[PDB]
Amino acid sequence: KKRRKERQKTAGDGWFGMKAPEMTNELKNDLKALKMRASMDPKRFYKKNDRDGFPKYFQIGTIVDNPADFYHSRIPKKQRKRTIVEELLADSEFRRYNRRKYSEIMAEKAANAA
Amino acid sequence: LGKIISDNLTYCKCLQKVGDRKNYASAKLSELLPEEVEAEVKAAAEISMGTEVSEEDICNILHLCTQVIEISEYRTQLYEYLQNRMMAIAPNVTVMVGELVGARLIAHAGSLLNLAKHAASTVQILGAEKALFRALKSRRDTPKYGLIYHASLVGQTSPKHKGKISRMLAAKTVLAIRYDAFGEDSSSAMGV
């Protein structure tokens, strides 16, 4: 039993011992946003999610800067944020579209209720 | 060499003594390294996978490890310097919690007199500020260790008793802080 318990704390040797992070309200908020990425952009379509639940083993990081992609692919440091949800809070394009869709549903629902 | 030797200072001294693998066989490392280990070090010299380095490459490596050993010599002198000033300014605190922990306690408050104004409960949880405010907002259980976790008395005790010892040490420690801050005589009689 104790040797089983130790083996479930890590992904295993096949993936070089990835650990399961402690779940928090900030980590859970990020994973919920990733699942609902289909509705962020009306002109972008995605495949179905691999699993309905959250993955047991995962890790969080940022993409390293490259000298070659100074103009092609690089975000200025003022626009960078600490977490995924704050990035969604910042950009105007996603906020502008989402508030129009949400208001339309409520305006439809208000007529539905009446 | 990196796998067999873990002491960083011992590693750099061996490099400073001998540059290349060829001179491992002739040279002697008895004063730096135990005789049983140096035989393993000497044996691995013949069976090596590394590439041969140029004369300029080995000279640059020698200059780097020379700088490494001098930092330890100065850091030891700086650590001995800290023990002397802690003994003169706050002798009673150093006897109780230690030189390093007492120095970190003073640095956190910014001064000895600022630390004296604090209560006994605050000194216990002085280091653990991130756990305190997280627990207070979420209405969870408060931390109990703080910077006192690295004290000598707290370290020796069993994990079940590390909670009781922390508050007993912290309550007694502030008594040494007040007397060292306000008393006009420097002695270790009370702290002992």
Partner: protein, 237 residues
């Protein structure tokens, strides 16, 4: 746009061992960097909290396209010995070295002397890569340097691929081992149709005491390309 530098991203394991998924606004295929802080061919890397992963480009590598295409087995796992035929500069070889890890070994064979110098420089940084600058058509000329292996990966792009693979499989491949062979239909026979070539190549494998098990195309990334996975001298069940 794309995956710009400075974006938060999540990494989760793939179905295959040693391979990872880079989940975000886009999903990329990544492997754990054996030498952190270095890019082999300018790929984008992600820093994880001491741990670093490198993106895998399916257009410049045929193994990545097969994985993205939905292959069942690649048989390349950590702690395995892999014989690689046609290493070229080593773009795909670097990702293979990441999968096998420190315990596994990769044997890189490349006849070209120009591309051979790049492999040696890559072998400087990765202790698990053994460069072999020799012709793959004559396995007996380098039989001293290679022990028994588990997986043979071939990307030689020659009309006589099956003969080259069979000669290497008999000499170095262990019983129960597997092979992954990439077939460019235009190279073996330009006159015949692409799929008729694929049926002929499968037949020649059976005549060499090799049992092919699966095949698939690499259509989104390559045209008239196929990958065949099989087993050599299967053990009795």
């Amino acid at each position: 746009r794309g995956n710009q530098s400075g974006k938060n991203v999540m990494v989760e394991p793939h179905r295959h061992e040693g391979v990872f998924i880079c989940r975000g606004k886009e999903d990329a295929l990544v492997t754990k960097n054996l030498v952190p802080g270095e890019s082999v061919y300018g790929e984008k890397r992600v820093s994880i909290s001491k741990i670093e992963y490198r993106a895998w480009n399916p257009f410049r590598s045929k193994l990545a396209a097969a994985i993205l295409g939905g292959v069942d087995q690649i048989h390349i796992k950590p702690g395995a010995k892999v014989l690689y035929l046609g290493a070229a500069s080593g773009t795909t070889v670097s990702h293979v070295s990441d999968i096998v890890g420190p315990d596994g070994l990769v044997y890189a064979v490349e006849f070209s002397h120009r591309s051979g110098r790049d492999l040696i420089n890559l072998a400087k940084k990765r202790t698990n890569i053994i460069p072999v600058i020799e012709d793959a058509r004559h396995p007996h000329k380098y039989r001293m340097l290679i022990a028994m292996v588990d997986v043979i990966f071939a990307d030689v792009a020659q009309p006589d691929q099956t003969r080259i693979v069979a000669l290497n499989a008999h000499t170095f491949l262990r019983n129960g081992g597997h092979f992954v062979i990439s077939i460019k239909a235009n190279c073996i026979d330009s006159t015949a149709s692409a799929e008729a070539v694929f049926a002929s190549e499968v037949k020649k494998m059976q005549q060499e005491n090799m049992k092919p098990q699966e095949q698939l195309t690499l259509e989104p990334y390559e045209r008239d390309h196929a990958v065949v996975v099989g087993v050599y001298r299967p053990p009795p069940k």
